[PDB]
């Protein structure tokens, strides 16, 4: 609750994060769980690779620990692996860096916790329900009695928004004005959109937070980028910077692939064995979280809009079905149900046609076939592909391509609403492919745009008196 | 798209059908599947009857083809069956007639496909979503460039409706004015309605398309039927025509009965073994598809109205109270749950409840009793809308009996609202009974009405300038 | 159908009750069942205690009637119990009083039947179905022919409402103006509300129907209560009356506690046995039925409003959930699904991973763990605005505290919206506690309010020309 002591963007961001992860205790536990998941993936994997004797486990009454090798031997068997030891050393260095960041992260969050309790007066018990609007009302009312900020200017409730969302408004405006290569023309497919978690991380590491970024303070743009002249040397410097960051990505490719290959397999293989159709459900597409997002919109407001409008969008995506597939389903159901009805009447009649060594199995198969076809056979209604279903999905999100409103029922509309709707299997595939795809897009497709990026940041960056250097659109 | 290359109706109907079966390819496949279903039913049945050695299959490790007899013997075993060979010859003649009609139909449908692509400019890809609306308005614009009709004003298409629906408006007006015997007074039941697929086929074969029908052209009524005189000789001729068509039906009775047998088996017996309650769901009743029809209404508009209004109608069939029972359920649940609670508290206390000769059986029977009663006990706070149910169903249908609106809750209303919405099982039964019932209704109940049918077709048949001879009501 | 034979209330109320219990035959049967439930509870209550030899039943093949003792001995064993014989004599006297009231009631309900059939012309078959408005539309039109009572007033169309609901409007206005102690401040809990069936019965027995009540006729207030003077002696007399009625309650406490014990114990426990979560569902309360009730509102209109608005209220009560647990669920699901995915991949790979010392149990326990966690994981995309919903509950219930509309999401709102909506189990507990709690509230908390009760009944009691003495608010 101190008198404007440390850079603001961070203080406010931390305050917001503490409100989101409902309370200090919850947040601390969440971070600890995040650290234990990494360590568990890595240690479980290195235990499966190195310590388990699969041959004895498989064939050659056996108790579970009959497989495992004693530690006095596991250490030697894992140590005589140069590749494994190297991956483990890099993994442990990343881990130690994350644990050290966590330490302070909590040493700096105890300060926000005391801020809440003593200056805002919202106990951690009343915080999951304290709500954002009131807190906003609390912080802005607190600004007076207790000194905070320069005091040159009193808070105005949009300052806090700019502080929390400075770099995110920049991402919104970058993606909105078609910088930042996302569209690609793949052979054998339409124009794909490839925007992942790692790619946006790299874009922010290149532009916003790094050793030689565009920003020096986290609230002020470096002095040269405001100058009209020397734009070409700045463009060359940015191009070289992004070249070398792309090369670091290309060199780290195997390790992130491993983790990506690994964590992912673990994450959904359970779900696959349970309900293989959970991966057929659709999610709201990182490109699409950035496209449908307003300028000064905190994460919880975007997500509230995005799930208020989720079931209309699933009703839309499921409303168009192939007639042909429908006809094939109907007739395959007829022929399979006919052969099965005959075989069922026989097994009912005598019961020794049952479990024909061949028949029983087919009966099931044929049963699987009839069930699949009946699932593909449409049932009555839901065929609208309506202007109206779109007319509600839009009412939620509020943005649509302008060539969508008329032809809501075509393959052009579905195909590029498809890109926003993101069925998950692809997400998981698209997050797997990002280790190997992000360096080459970063080296080839973005380096030509560096001279346009420089002109964006020079042209669209306003200095607002209290907040510093913010995007020009987010005003 | 040759100008006046044909009478308007056999062209417009085909165009409409091509829009419905979404595209030429789809339609072709659908027809092929329709031809393969007939051939499969007949060949599978004759294989089951004639080639399989059931004794070895049942009792006397055995592979499946150990049952089947070699073809060199199947041919002789199926050939030495006069009844089977005769049924197969009649079946093959009907099949060959259907295959020849199919070849002629696709040779005539390639012309409609070229019509679409070249004169309407709707590719087969944009046709499942082109929409009827698009083409119906569009052709009317084509009427200028690619001319049709020797002397044609741009098609209002109001007329075009007339072309597609000439004979169907006649059926609607026949059933609407209570010609065409449908109501019957069966002993042991109320007034049944018996209107099937075969019966309406026979009515149309008698009245509209045949060797000596009422119509000579498909768009013009024969010249004598417009004359007021000679009505009695025309009535006698129509009566003799329908007598002999009924006798042809009576002679073909065994074959159509056999057909309705096997197709259903395969079609339904599978569904019975899977979900015996799927046949308890209700369907919209061929009488009822003709009763709830609306002026000049293409099939897809009727079906859209009919399924928009399907779930309200199931909630209605579902809704009525049976109140006195409710009380019996409540109080039987009380007394049974009381005795069971005592016996349960005892078996929990000591666990030596058993050895009583009937105890355990008493607990099980009492549990069944409580569960049945609780199923009959209405759920509290379950809303009831008799007025609404007999209101929203009408809003979707738009036609109502004048004695339904007041007493929505009586057995008179349910009993005759049932016929319109009758359940699938009585549908399958009523389609089974039509081979044996259609000839006798056709001979006995319709031949007395021939003099009224003649007066209908003389009185209600207007000559509209562009379309020809249409029903007088459908104007 | 005669003229003014009985008090209008004693006629109109009966007419309304006959419409509610749909018909005379129903009403009778319901009353008979009500009489048989009392006698059945008391019977075994006494057969289980007195005639059954539990020792032989438990331990010392045995048929059920091997336990029971012969009647020649049951009579002596139940007769040599002074406490049991005394409870049975009091129970039999209450029963005989109820049976005599039942005979008198059906002898008076036949008259009413005849009223329906002959003067209203609504047969008992068309009654469950008559609908309320129609009777209203029938009785008021009948007032001309079979003249109604005095016939002083033609039907008011409100008069019937006042007649049926005279004392209930008084209860509504008493509870509405915070007479009638309901709120209590218990230690260890918030302000509890204790309003039961027995408490409201006692309030009505004290105020409305008794030997020395406020009312002498059932439609006229005693003459002294209209006088401004002598208010203090009337207050003292009312205080003494309620003191002695409270003392009668305190003396009858053991018997009502037992009966409350017996009648309740039997019913609910079995249900809990079946589904222990049925008692976690919530019901509207005697209170809350009196708080949310309009003035001249018949019981069926209140209950229609109350169940139209029941599911919104359950959605509200279930909306608040722990942030912390969620996190535990998510991460336990991760770790369990990870170990299970590994073990599943192994059992798929070789199939002999199974049959290992812990193999056929770890997979099952881990599957249960993942399923439990996934049930605790909230559905992502799940939209709950607690604040928004209360709006629909209000649209149905129609009454609310002012300080709810803003803070719909707080514990203050839930805590006192809890009182209106409390779950069954506290209902059954609160009906159990009323025998022992009603006398002390009646003696201590209401006797101080007697001088305010007298001033209420003097100030708010209007004489309306046709109906007599009605509450002043219910106008």
Swiss-Prot record, chains A, B, C:
One of its GO terms (molecular function) is phospholipid scramblase activity. Residues 107-242, 254-271, 281-323, 377-422, 433-435 are cytoplasmic. Keywords: Acetylation, Autophagy, Cytoplasmic vesicle, Endoplasmic reticulum, Endosome, Glycoprotein, Golgi apparatus, Lipid transport, Membrane, Mitochondrion, Phosphoprotein, Transmembrane, Transmembrane helix, Transport, Ubl conjugation. This is Autophagy-related protein 9A. Belongs to the ATG9 family. Ufmylated in a DDRGK1 dependent manner. Forms a homotrimer with a solvated central pore, which is connected laterally to the cytosol through the cavity within each protomer. Acts as a lipid scramblase that uses its central pore to function: the central pore opens laterally to accommodate lipid headgroups, thereby enabling lipid flipping and redistribution of lipids added to the outer leaflet of ATG9A-containing vesicles, thereby enabling growth into autophagosomes. The tyrosine-based sorting signal motif, also named YXX-psi motif, promotes interaction with the AP-4 complex. It is a multi-pass membrane protein. GO terms for biological process: autophagosome assembly; bone morphogenesis; innate immune response; mitophagy; negative regulation of interferon-beta production; negative regulation of macrophage cytokine production; piecemeal microautophagy of the nucleus; programmed necrotic cell death. Residues 243-253, 272-280, 423-432, 436-444 dip into the membrane without crossing it. Phospholipid scramblase involved in autophagy by mediating autophagosomal membrane expansion. Cycles between the preautophagosomal structure/phagophore assembly site (PAS) and the cytoplasmic vesicle pool and supplies membrane for the growing autophagosome. Lipid scramblase activity plays a key role in preautophagosomal structure/phagophore assembly by distributing the phospholipids that arrive through ATG2 (ATG2A or ATG2B) from the cytoplasmic to the luminal leaflet of the bilayer, thereby driving autophagosomal membrane expansion. One of its GO terms (cellular component) is Golgi apparatus. Homotrimer; forms a homotrimer with a central pore that forms a path between the two membrane leaflets. Interacts (via cytoplasmic its C-terminus) with ATG2A. Interacts with SUPT20H. Interacts (via the tyrosine-based sorting signal motif) with AP4M1; promoting association with the AP-4 complex. Interacts with ARFIP1 and ARFIP2. Interacts with PI4K2A and PI4KB. Interacts with ATG4A; the interaction is direct and promotes ATG9A trafficking. The gene is ATG9A. It catalyses: a 1,2-diacyl-sn-glycero-3-phosphocholine(in) = a 1,2-diacyl-sn-glycero-3-phosphocholine(out); a 1,2-diacyl-sn-glycero-3-phospho-L-serine(in) = a 1,2-diacyl-sn-glycero-3-phospho-L-serine(out); a 1,2-diacyl-sn-glycero-3-phosphoethanolamine(in) = a 1,2-diacyl-sn-glycero-3-phosphoethanolamine(out). Residues 50-80, 350-358 are lumenal. The chain crosses the membrane at residues 27-49, 81-106, 324-349, 359-376. It is found in: Preautophagosomal structure membrane; Cytoplasmic vesicle, Autophagosome membrane; Golgi apparatus, trans-Golgi network membrane; Late endosome membrane. Its main location: membrane. It comes from Homo sapiens.
């Amino acid at each position: 609750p101190w008198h404007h002591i440390e850079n603001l963007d961070l203080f406010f961001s931390r305050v917001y994060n503490l409100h989101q992860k409902n309370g200090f205790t919850c947040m601390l536990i969440g971070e600890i769980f995040e650290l234990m998941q990494f360590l568990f993936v890595v240690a479980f994997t290195t235990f499966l690779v190195s310590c388990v004797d699969y041959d004895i486990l498989f064939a050659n009454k056996v108790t579970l620990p009959d497989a495992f090798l004693p530690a006095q031997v596991c250490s030697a068997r894992i140590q005589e692996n140069g590749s494994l030891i190297t991956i483990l050393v890099i993994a442990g260095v990343f881990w130690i860096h994350r644990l050290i960041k966590f330490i302070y992260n909590i040493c700096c969050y105890w300060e926000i916790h005391s801020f809440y309790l003593h200056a805002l007066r919202i106990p951690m018990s009343a915080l999951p329900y304290c709500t954002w609007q009131e807190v906003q009302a609390r912080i802005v009312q607190t600004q007076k009695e207790h000194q905070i900020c320069i005091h040159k200017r009193e808070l105005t409730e949009l300052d806090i928004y700019h502080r929390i969302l400075r770099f995110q408004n920049y991402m919104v405006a970058l993606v909105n004005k078609s910088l930042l290569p996302l569209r690609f023309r793949l052979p054998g497919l339409g124009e794909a959109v490839f925007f992942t978690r790692g790619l946006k991380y790299n874009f922010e590491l290149i532009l916003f937070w790094g050793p030689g970024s565009l920003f020096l303070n986290e609230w002020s743009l470096k002095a040269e980028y405001k100058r009209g002249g020397q734009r070409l040397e700045l463009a060359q410097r940015l191009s070289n910077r992004i070249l070398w960051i792309g090369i670091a990505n290309f060199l780290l490719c195997p390790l992130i692939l491993i983790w990506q290959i690994l964590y992912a397999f673990f994450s959904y293989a359970e779900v696959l064995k349970r309900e293989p159709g959970a991966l057929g459900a659709r999610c709201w597409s990182l490109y699409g979280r950035c496209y449908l997002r307003h300028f000064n919109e905190l994460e919880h407001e975007l997500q509230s809009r995005l799930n208020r409008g989720y079931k209309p969008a699933s009703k839309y995506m499921n409303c168009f079905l192939s007639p042909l597939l429908t006809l094939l389903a109907k007739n395959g159901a007829f022929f399979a149900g006919s052969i099965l009805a005959v075989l069922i009447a026989l097994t009912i009649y005598d019961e020794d046609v049952l479990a024909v060594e061949h028949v029983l199995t087919t009966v099931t198969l044929l049963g699987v076939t009839v069930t699949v076809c009946r699932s593909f056979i449409p049932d009555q209604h839901m065929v609208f592909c309506p202007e109206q279903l779109l007319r509600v999905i839009l009412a939620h999100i509020h943005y649509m391509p302008d060539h969508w409103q008329g032809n809501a029922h075509r393959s052009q509309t579905r195909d590029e609403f498809a890109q926003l709707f993101q069925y998950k299997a692809v997400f998981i595939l698209e997050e797997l492919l990002s280790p190997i795809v992000t360096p080459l897009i970063l080296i080839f497709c973005l380096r030509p745009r560096a001279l346009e990026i420089i002109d964006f940041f020079r042209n669209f960056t306003v200095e607002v008196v209290g907040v510093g250097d913010t995007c020009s659109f987010a005003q």
